[PDB]
Amino acid sequence: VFSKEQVQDMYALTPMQEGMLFHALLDQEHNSHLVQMSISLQGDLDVGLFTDSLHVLVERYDVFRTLFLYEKLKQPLQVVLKQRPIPIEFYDLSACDESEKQLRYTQYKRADQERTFHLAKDPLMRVALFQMSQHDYQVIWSFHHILMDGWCFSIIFDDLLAIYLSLQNKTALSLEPVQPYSRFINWLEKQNKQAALNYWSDYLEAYEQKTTLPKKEAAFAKAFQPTQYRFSLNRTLTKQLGTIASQNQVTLSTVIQTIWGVLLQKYNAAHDVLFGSVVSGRPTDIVGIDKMVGLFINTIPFRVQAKAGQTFSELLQAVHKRTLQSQPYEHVPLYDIQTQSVLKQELIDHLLVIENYPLVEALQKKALNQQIGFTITAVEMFEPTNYDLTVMVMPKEELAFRFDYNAALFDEQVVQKLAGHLQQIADCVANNSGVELCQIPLLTEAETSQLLAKRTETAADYPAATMHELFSRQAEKTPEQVAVVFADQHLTYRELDEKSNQLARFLRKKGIGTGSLVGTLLDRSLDMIVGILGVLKAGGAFVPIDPELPAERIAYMLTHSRVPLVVTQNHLRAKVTTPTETIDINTAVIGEESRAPIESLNQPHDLFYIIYTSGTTGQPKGVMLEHRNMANLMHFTFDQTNIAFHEKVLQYTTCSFDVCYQEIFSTLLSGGQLYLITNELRRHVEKLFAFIQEKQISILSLPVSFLKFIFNEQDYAQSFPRCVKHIITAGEQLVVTHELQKYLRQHRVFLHNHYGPSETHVVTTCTMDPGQAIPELPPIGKPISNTGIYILDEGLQLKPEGIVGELYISGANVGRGYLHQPELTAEKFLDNPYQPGERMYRTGDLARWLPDGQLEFLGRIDHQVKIRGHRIELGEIESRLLNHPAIKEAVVIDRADETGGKFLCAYVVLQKALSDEEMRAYLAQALPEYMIPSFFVTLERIPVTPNGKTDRRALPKPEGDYVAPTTELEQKLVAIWEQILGVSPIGIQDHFFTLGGHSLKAIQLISRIQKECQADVPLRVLFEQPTIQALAAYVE
Amino acid sequence: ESILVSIWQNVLGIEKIGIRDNFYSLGGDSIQAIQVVARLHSYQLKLETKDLLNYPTIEQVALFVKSTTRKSDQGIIAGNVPLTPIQKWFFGKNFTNTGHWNQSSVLYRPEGFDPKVIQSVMDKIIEHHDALRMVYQHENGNVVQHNRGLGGQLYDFFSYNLTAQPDVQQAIEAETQRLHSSMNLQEGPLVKVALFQTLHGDHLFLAIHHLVVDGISWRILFEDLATGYAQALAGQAISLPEKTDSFQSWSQWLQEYANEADLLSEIPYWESLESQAKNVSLPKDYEVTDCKQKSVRNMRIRLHPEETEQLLKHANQAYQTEINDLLLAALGLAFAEWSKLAQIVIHLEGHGREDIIEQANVARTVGWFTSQYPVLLDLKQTAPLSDYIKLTKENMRKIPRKGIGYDILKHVTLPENRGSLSFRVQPEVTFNYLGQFDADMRTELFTRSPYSGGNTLGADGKNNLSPESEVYTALNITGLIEGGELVLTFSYSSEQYREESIQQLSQSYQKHLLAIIAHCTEKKEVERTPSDFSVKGLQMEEMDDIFELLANRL
Ligand SMILES: *P(=O)(O)OCC(C)(C)[C@@H](O)C(=O)NCCNC(=O)Cc1ccc(C2=C3CC[C@@H](OC(=O)NCCNC(=O)CCNC(=O)[C@H](O)C(C)(C)COP(*)(=O)O)CCC[C@H]3C(C)=NN2)cc1
């Protein structure tokens, strides 16, 4: 029975005892945070004197008699009992046979790994002796970590063997006085806490984007299966890393940590990467701390940050300085440091541990120092761990590595490749200390040749015939067929060819030729196609101009291109205010020109098409397509796609962006029937699908925004065209709304997603959806014939599959450059470092190879949103918004506030009423709080750039978070929050950690609730439903 | 230094470490540094790894290798010495004849003392401790202390033979009464010495001005004089223990500490004290504003040796108290019965030296270090004595630095720095408990003169203040043990109280002290109190709730 006399002392917990108390209270339903040694001893061992020496050892150390009391107290306490014998069991297995002995042993050892400790009621150490044979023993010795750092076992076992020798040889204990752990508790209370929290808030000052490693799936359930992978570097690589360290004036630990940092940077596409470091938080100021038994090991955030031009040497010195600066403050609890970060709970998500001196080998050699009757013959260690990955590094003669990972979250191939990447970085650094960080490759030859073969697997032979030669050679195949149709008039291929010959004869008489760009300002009436083909047949490049564009742009294009001639309709001539000849395409002299074929008086490689893109310059830049770029497209589109000869296709787009003419050429060069969209039907969608039905139209070209929105409008839903068979789209990250998903099934319409910047060619990847399944955010697909896609880093280094990097395009669909402003071309086009001689072009877009070999889009590199520390697919938010039957049309944008802080706002068009909290709840039903927009705006229609892409300029500025009203039904329920958090009178809706709570204060909250309300609310419930609303299930 | 050139090699395992090879380049490490520091600690040198790692070259880290122990000046210090709080209190009290406020004792030796031998001792013993040479400049409308470089006028010495008068005690009394008057505080020997020859042997007089001496300092001085005299009688060269931080350096670091953030942290405690004490007032038999020491009379109460040995050896265990906690609880009960006030404030003389300045060592310093702090006693809930004793223990444990702070705030902190503290509370009653008399009988080579007269160290000294001095405390209560009996002396101002009322208060004290001794011996359980458990801010309700929760969990 208890009596007060049995308590020796009480203390508050140290920071890391508080951390492992948190663990033990969290994981209770399957808890185990339990070191297990197995030590095998051969020789003669008196199990009596080993029992007695264990009991003396437990008397000697107060931490072996500590029990932790948290139930109803204001504060967790250590309680040190005066006497507390531990369970010691002796099993004489020596009568059993080997196959029985080793089974009974392993069954015990496995069950002992399962047998949890009660931090209060049960002694926190266990020993078992097994006598396997007349001179063979195994010790299983398991203890909660909260007691001590596992490495302390070297001291504890030296003490144990000293006690055993003193007993068996009847001699007094020479053991030096135990360094009391209350010295550390007192020193922790004497220290200036706030100066340390200020250091840690400075250390994390600019930390923007959370680090990651490629997780297999969202953690839908806490399934865990501890799995390992291990590998080691060669002798020479290890010694050369050691030389690098000895010469950059750092420890090899700093080299290992910098190499890990560089790996994390390459995997994260970021220059600032933070990971957890496990540090021996033993301050050198404490007397005798080097032999003090207790829990000191602390997890601290370790941060490696690269400048854009920094060398690895210069990052080594930076990391050295940072680690030296951190050492004064590494006793701070990580649960406090987390509050000094915008990431809060998610700051650290994996650990790198360097084991300069393990417990094994050390314990496996010290025992040779004594004349006792036994020798340590084998040794083992087990330790559960919470993190999904831990990296252990052991700088032996070969630098050995081990990954302890949850196989529920990381694939074996992911860890295998990560190990190969670590080897490659290590070798690169070892050979040349001074390599640029962006110039270290991750990839071995097996990765490299595969990624380059992903180019050549697109290889093809094509005749490279001129685009108007390919037309001519097709038009003779069906001269009687109607090629182009307008409101009522039409042209056959014969009529097109004749009229184009006439115009080409006129132009050539007018001096048009290989050097010559011909303007067209034609009203998308029939003559526009004749204009194109006649200008090309005249051997010159057509420059399409929009009647609706500003006169400022119509002037800028004409004055910047140095176009000698423009062709227009009569009524549009007045737009051409420049001093340049302006020919009516109806001119009778051209009607009188000779209709027979003109000659292909041009080379296979000349320019033929200039269009001007928007961008970051206020000046649009004229981009130009060589004949080879489009010729490469047309043959691939025939060979491997589902355009067909007999199909009927609208030229819908606004006659000035790369896709629009690519519909024309694909339609013409396959004998189909083009219909010229009346520019009023470009807006009245009510008429578009009607015209599609009436003309049985079958191929459509539609911007991505059109698919995000127009098929979602409930009024339009029933007017969807039944004759359609293919819809082709390009422009933006595609969102296939659930309505559009359904309006694909009903008619099995093939939707095609095409990636393409203008400078490469109208498309360079395709994905085609038949309607087996359609994800909401489809990929951009596979590289077209004679193209490579290279996901590079900034040093043009290939980067591993599945990882975000710059999307470079190569092959015949690469243009000559920028027409004028030519100096920008050298910034955007270059030679392919991996296929020298082929041109290369950079899109400012990040992409990722999927495991199936599809290409996956990650938006522009200029606009990485990363709000509240977390990257946020605006496509996911736009998906959840657009799926709501209340929402017609959602655009989600990162804004900058009037302080320069980025924040999310959703611009939303509402079919039927709802209000800010209603959609905020709708998002919270499916989307994390970091990716719910802080403001919402209602508009009549999202503005669209004439090409259909949404206009980030044309949206109104926000005006005027977690805040919610006061609502308390029972302040008796809230006053615990009031007293623990201290912030204010509280609202019922408010969120514990958002209000500045943290793990340990949750323990205080539970112990208060389970005193003042006498309910044992699990520590998990405060995380599932971290608000005062959650109580209802416990009181109704 | 070559010591560290070695200690690296015998840790890192790399030979021929140079004067500026690099700890890391040699292969140092985050841990191996701890080993190097521990190995250097065997040479009594301290080095933070925070410097070994940060200045990773021997030539550069030599700038931070320090001795583990200082060796404070064994020579001479001189010049201005800032007034300590007790000294500023003294000059603020403005006594009539401040030159008559002293401490003294009279030694004896069975075969006497050779005058030249004891004078030769007093030469060196007054050289060694510097504060005893100080003088107090009665100028510039204020006082400033000065300490004197060696010369003449260290101490004043007188010699007498009393054998001509059979009443030797009266002759030595009347002659020693002179010297107490003769402290030329402006410039003169603040140590007075006399020798009185007699048929029974030689009587040796020492007297010192209180501004430069203390009880603990009188122990120090007697053990120093005992070794000095043993050395002189043995004929060896006289030399003395190594000097600790000499009093000038103490005053200096004290004024440096007197403004630090540590002491200022106490301010809300001493505010809670003064704000709660405001209305205390011990009632008076006669209303008078001041009295003179000649009006003071003293009376004594005694405990028998059995009760004394119970009080010392056993009562402490019932509550893990110390002796002061029981004596003060008995005093509380006595005032609860006698004064019938709800509260009283009792002043206590702590010895100071309270490890305040972390670098300081004053274990051998001679000076007036006494720190005076008030304590408020609750007198209401006296009925459950089992809990009045605990309330008194924990009140004594709530004093933040054993009271050294309050005098510094009162006299030496910068006056804008010290907050709302009024310092208006005045010592109507003061309580002290001395240890054994063995602070005087600390060596056998000489003994206290049987003719001690009024010339004792403590409150039973009679000559050591001028009869014309003010009464600074109305009730002065001091404990001592002699011959195994506790004695409490009540000294009081006649013309503020009459004899019967102090007889009453002293009998109420003896009654309740006996009651507490008994209660603490009859109780067989150790009922520990929240201060025993090394948890900051623990309270009775929480401690007993924790203990209830242990019973519900074991
Ligand atoms: P709430 O919102 O409040 O949030 C707070 C949280 C985060 C929830 C908090 O409660 C929390 O969960 N705590 C932090 C995260 N939890 C953990 O699980 C932390 C943790 C992980 C792993 C372990 C154990 C390890 C790792 C230690 C291994 O390394 C090692 O050798 N021991 C410590 C390091 N020092 C040494 O002993 C020797 C190695 N070298 C060193 O000296 C240092 O490592 C340097 C200085 C960093 C390198 O030296 P130099 O080259 O610079 C060994 C054992 C392996 C596991 C085991 C078995 N047990 N524990 C503990 C906690």
Ligand SMILES: Nc1ncnc2c1ncn2[C@@H]1O[C@H](COP(=O)(O)OC(=O)[C@@H]2CCCN2)[C@@H](O)[C@H]1O
């Ligand atoms: N399907 C797509 N998915 C993702 N990004 C796309 C897609 N199509 C183009 N991009 C984007 O096109 C950008 C470059 O082409 P640019 O915007 O100058 O031209 C145009 O966009 C013209 C205008 C009419 C249609 N093409 C890329 O960075 C990529 O984000």
